Curated annotation (Swiss-Prot), chain A:
Subunit structure and binding partners: Dimer of heterotrimers each composed of an alpha, a beta and a gamma chain. Alpha and beta are catalytic chains; gamma chains are involved in binding the enzyme complex to the cytoplasmic membrane. Interacts with the NarJ chaperone.
Domain of life, source organism: Bacteria
Protein function: The nitrate reductase enzyme complex allows E.coli to use nitrate as an electron acceptor during anaerobic growth. The alpha chain is the actual site of nitrate reduction.
Top-level taxonomy: Bacteria, Pseudomonadati, Pseudomonadota, Gammaproteobacteria, Enterobacterales
Species: Escherichia coli (strain K12)
Protein known as: Respiratory nitrate reductase 1 alpha chain
Curated annotation (Swiss-Prot), chain B:
Protein name: Nitrate reductase molybdenum cofactor assembly chaperone NarJ
Family: Belongs to the NarJ/NarW family.
Any one GO molecular function term: unfolded protein binding
Primary location: cytoplasm
Subunit structure: Binds specifically to the NarG subunit of the apoenzyme complex at two distinct sites, one interfering with membrane anchoring and another being involved in molybdenum insertion.
Residues of the full protein shown: 1 to 166 of 236
Statement: the UniProt record of this protein carries the keyword Cytoplasm: yes
Amino acid sequence: SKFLDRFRYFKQK
Amino acid sequence: MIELVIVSRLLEYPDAALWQHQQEMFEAIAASKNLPKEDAHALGIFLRDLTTMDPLDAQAQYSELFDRGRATSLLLFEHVHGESRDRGQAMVDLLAQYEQHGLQLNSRELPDHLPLYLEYLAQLPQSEAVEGLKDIAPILALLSARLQQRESRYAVLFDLLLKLAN
């Protein structure tokens, strides 16, 4: 997965 | 906005992952659709300047600049609310605004940490993200102003964000 498409602070609910 | 993610990474504590994905970022910056040619250049200059340093040396400069002081803090509400109790409610209201968009904190950073806030903005539709930058634009401009006083190229990232705001 592309780096800029990986979350660094959040996650989905 | 991919640009908001890109600045969010560049405005964070310089992580080693920046060096190993510089190619991906350089290309994303180059193919940017939201930044005029001259600003994408300035951003690519910034990344190249950053990743030609050793990360240990990038990390040290970053701390000398953002972690030693309050005037250059990346916690937004430290620039908005003088009373500590006002900051608290602001953070709660920001956390809830994140929860409204189906986003949950998965970090050990505060909700008004600018890089984190930029990650949130990047998840929004174009207009929704642009309003977000307009909301913090006086903060962006103060920080840029202060960084320029210390003759630091991180100011570039604030000017770019201000540009993206208009």
